[PDB]
Structure 1
């Protein structure tokens, strides 16, 4: 009777759930899992730190709608991975963290095992569910549980603990075949009732000044034409959140993105589609919303997200594709939004965009670009080459890129997200390249970059078509903060370094860009090369402001 083992049953179960890629870092007790995964013909991306393998997994989940899978070792490796899992869960990205763990007997008596930790218990605050697979016979069910939990309801992170003793267990191939199975419909549709839709429809029809807010939940849903149809049929102005950019093209005539403050302050009805009324929307409170309670329509798969911050006048619970489809039919043939309202917003958008144009054409000294004339080059490039992932993080580097760089296609913009995480950059690049097979451009604050910068080597090792643009202003927000004391560097300063040389250290191509012309030539060559590149963009140390757009959130001393 022929036998197989835990290693192979796990490999088979993952494949049966349509996993063909893992992101991780090897070591005891999972090195041979990664090896045999590769031997079987599957993809393993080895990173320089598990956190970045984890961030890769998180965004693979977002882009594909199936869980990104991260593989780590026990205690120290797991901890690094779980920080990323926490980020996945916060952002509603489907992800499975797989980690090796040590001996149950020793760990449970806290005796000081190799990399000792109750990883299953430690994971709980950071994921939807934390499981452990103890027996070879339970591998298929365990992986099914993990996948379903990751992709159903509000998508998010799942931890699966894999004790070292699992892998060496054996079972007959006959019995293994009998246990292996593919879950049916792991991310089911959830359809709202007619009266929930009708309530929303009535609110929208009676609105004088409606807006639609598209969140990354709407982008994640992959029902791009449904959402575009709703916007265009209703004639309602829309606003995208950071990663909802490109769901409809950012240059769509009904976009009110360039007059956000006025749009939100003056609207009466606001339709939230896969977007939380959280800190990014000032909790539906304060001067952002004209110091009044708006009439909110909200479409969300998570029932208890309703009334989290402000009373929701028309809650619609279900998956966005089902709900928007029904809402469209409910609104069939209804009058479009008032031309006075939409025309007023468009006039402001045109005016503000004209002002931005002026800023982007401004001339600066060599090696002293500002955020407008530098990012203006990236804007033009992305308008001409929209089928490219745009990774973005920083303060000024984040906010100005969100403003300036129009996305024409969905799920291309990948940024710091709900927790405003610095560190997602290089991991996001690896996963974006891996899952799309297309180029990636990253616009990185120089501080932001340092959180994941060593993964430049990972990007070179896999010869990925990634161009990293460092917005090198020489520090956090600014690069010119004075020494607080004699010979003492300010805490916000960074070396205005040759990141180009660091890229070249690992076989990539480096550029220095001192002017917009040089940045343009570098970017065009870099993307065309299809090879790993870094462009060191020399930004004026005085160009940025404190915390970018969220300056007012800082706590300052008054004594």
Structure 2
């Protein structure tokens, strides 16, 4: 009768579970797998490097709460994708790295097969889960296992190994169709115990200076209405982490973002909503949090092992952010005195003061452009385009764009994440445009852009509405370092006055060079209104910024 093969079973299983996009790099043994995927209706985005394909799948999971799919080749390409898979596991982004595998009997004897590697054994230390499928009748379960492990609990990167012999296996079509699995409740809701919610309300009500910390886990949870209702109805000031910006508008009257240091030092009870007390929050120790013993933490997290990871947590609340926030909110709507207005006014005054010190730098046109004057232009662009996605990476380009550029809608800012990775830029830009269809503004340091620069060709090839702004200051941090022996360039500088706009022109994209904030503002508007792939080489003062 009718027959099917491993090629079609893999594709049929992915389509059955809502997968629409495959980021990949072709080659042996997965070339015809990607072709069949494209012929079956899936959109296939081919990159110049598997790591950039993996970065796209990673941020795609963050944007969609569905696992981003990265398909790669044996050993060398698998390793390029595994580095992105490890970064996805670090940031709690759901993702499935699918990779071709060589002949199992040669690899297990280490006889030197083509692209030889026990990729299953190599992947496990660096990701959340790893599975290998040897039989075509198990492709449905294998994909189902990979999806569950990627989106359930704490989301993360999963590795799905498919040996080349699997694709050519042939079984009965009706048998294979019944073997496919459409996953029921891939990321199930987990509700907290009422005894834990009651303990959290008790601590929260006792606070003289409470504070909510919104992490990117709260943004990933996509409980926007519930999270915002928790902030407003409680009246407690909040501070968003980098990728939680825009969940509430960064100009919200309860936002203490421009007063982050005071809100963290002077608070007494802190509510962590999908935010880890890691290096980004000084591990809960030091002067950042005031004197030892002055803090009490309530924590909302799907992973119960994250509790007591750094300091004592008196009110652990385990469950998905959607279910736990609504449980806290339902306890607040039935009983809540109010946040002390003294704490509100202290943060509001210090916030306005910091914004006042910031305002002159934004309107300080000078030659050459400083970081502040250029970001003042891009901040207005985002304010005028609150639906656009902002990719951002670098050091000065990153740390200053985070504090200057206000976000207004959730999940619109995508940056270096937990490992502080340089190289996420162009891969994130491709996935942001592919997944959402919104315009992407990619604010890049010139050192950060170089880690993934060749993907501007991929951006051009698929005609994506990405506007790349390179803060060209001729180096890492600054461009003033020099060789004391007078023989080489500096360890941290690049070719002086590099014209990255000419690099974009090499692939049919728009290339612009600007030297003033107004020239930058006009060039960005032209690019984001037209939707054409654009790279804007912006000249930044090589002396401005910091070495850190």
TM-score by length of 1: 0.97
The question of 1:132 aligning with 2:132 is answered yes
* Mapping 1:60-79, distance limit 5 Å: 60-79=60-79
- Measure how far apart 1:25 and its partner are: 0.2
Q: What do residues 224-246 of structure 1 show as CA deviations (whole Å, max 9, x unaligned)? A: 01010010011111000010000
The question of 1:265 aligning with 2:271 is answered no
Aligned to 2:167: 167
Aligned to 1:521: 522
Distance 2:493 2:484 in 1: 11
Distance 1:505 1:106 in 2: 43
Any idea what SS the aligned residue of 2:468 has? strand
Partners of 2:365 and 2:516 within 8 A in 1? no
Any idea what SS the aligned residue of 1:243 has? helix
Distance 1:363 1:7 in 2: 58
* Mapping 1:398-547, distance limit 5 Å: 398-495=398-495, 496-547=497-548
Aligned to 1:303: 304
Distance 2:118 2:74 in 1: 10
Q: What do residues 299-325 of structure 1 show as CA deviations (whole Å, max 9, x unaligned)? A: 000001000000001000000000000
Aligned to 2:105: 105
- Alignment coverage as a number of residue pairs: 545
Q: What do residues 479-533 of structure 1 show as CA deviations (whole Å, max 9, x unaligned)? A: 1112221132110111231000000110000111100010011011011110100
Aligned to 1:335: 337
Any idea what SS the aligned residue of 2:244 has? coil
Distance 1:2 1:331 in 2: 60
Aligned to 2:395: 395
Q: What do residues 57-97 of structure 1 show as CA deviations (whole Å, max 9, x unaligned)? A: 00000000000000000000000000000000000000000
Aligned to 2:154: 154
Any idea what SS the aligned residue of 1:191 has? strand
Aligned to 2:364: 362
Moved over 3 A (4+): none
Any idea what SS the aligned residue of 2:243 has? coil
Partners of 2:391 and 2:413 within 8 A in 1? yes
TM-score by length of 2: 0.99
Any idea what SS the aligned residue of 1:506 has? coil
* Pairwise CA RMSD: 0.7
Aligned to 2:114: 114
Aligned to 2:178: 178
- Measure how far apart 1:276 and its partner are: 0.2
Match of 2:348 among 346, 349, 353: 346
Distance 2:227 2:178 in 1: 43
Q: What do residues 128-185 of structure 1 show as CA deviations (whole Å, max 9, x unaligned)? A: 1110000000000000000000000000000000000000000111111211221111
Q: What do residues 273-330 of structure 1 show as CA deviations (whole Å, max 9, x unaligned)? A: 0000000000000010013241000000000100000000100000000000000111
* Mapping 1:56-95, distance limit 5 Å: 56-95=56-95
When structure 1 is superposed on structure 2, of 180-189 and 275-284 the one drifting more is: 180-189
Partners of 2:482 and 2:491 within 8 A in 1? no
Partners of 2:297 and 2:313 within 8 A in 1? yes
Distance 1:282 1:121 in 2: 34
* Mapping 1:225-304, distance limit 5 Å: 225-293=225-293, 294-304=295-305
Runs of 5+ consecutive residues of structure 1 not aligned to the other structure: 548-559
- Measure how far apart 1:126 and its partner are: 1.5
Distance 2:183 2:363 in 1: 55
